[PDB]
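Honest question from a wet-lab person: if I give you the sequences of every part of a complex, can you actually get the arrangement of the whole thing, not just the pieces? Trying it with mine:
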Amino acid sequence: XXXXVXX
Amino acid sequence: XXXXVXX
Amino acid sequence: XXXXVXX
Amino acid sequence: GKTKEGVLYVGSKTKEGVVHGVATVAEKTKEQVTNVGGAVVTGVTAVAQKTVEGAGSIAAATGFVKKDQL
Amino acid sequence: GKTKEGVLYVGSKTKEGVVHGVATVAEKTKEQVTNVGGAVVTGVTAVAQKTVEGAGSIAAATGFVKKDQL
Amino acid sequence: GKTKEGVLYVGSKTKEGVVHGVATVAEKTKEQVTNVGGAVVTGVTAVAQKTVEGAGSIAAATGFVKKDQL
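Yes, you can. This is the full assembly:
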């Protein structure tokens, strides 16, 4: 479950 | 379940 | 479960 | 000479917000709530009352029931 | 000459916020709540009352019931 | 000449906040709450009452019940 946000 | 957001 | 945020 | 008398509001009011990134993962989970600037309203009873030189009566009830027989 | 008499508000009001990044993971979890600037309202009874030279009566009830037989 | 009489507010009010990064992980966990600037309201009874030269009565009840038979 790799939730990777990157703004 | 790899939710990857990238703005 | 690798939640990686990066603004 | 404003009057608000006998008025109700339920839910949400938003003026001029921003929300960039809201990512969510639920896996093998019974219940999961992700709320951002929102109202998640469940199983509420709300009564507001003003009486003047009068008689006022209210009876209010809410029954919320959820069963999950597995 | 404003009056708010017999008024109710339930939920959320937002004016001009920001929320950049809200990431969440629930795995093998019974219950999980992620709330940001939000209202998560569950199982509430709320009564406001003003009487003047009068009779006022209220009966309010909330029943919230959740069963999960596995 | 403002009056608020018989009014209720339940939930959240936000004006002009910021929230940058809110990351959360729940793994094999019964209950988990992450709250930021938010209201998570559960199982509350709230009564406000003003009477003047009058009779006022309120009966309020909340029952919150949660069972998880595994």
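Two things worth pointing out. The interface with chain A takes residues 1-7 of chain C (CB under 8 Å). DSSP finds no helices and no strands in chain C.
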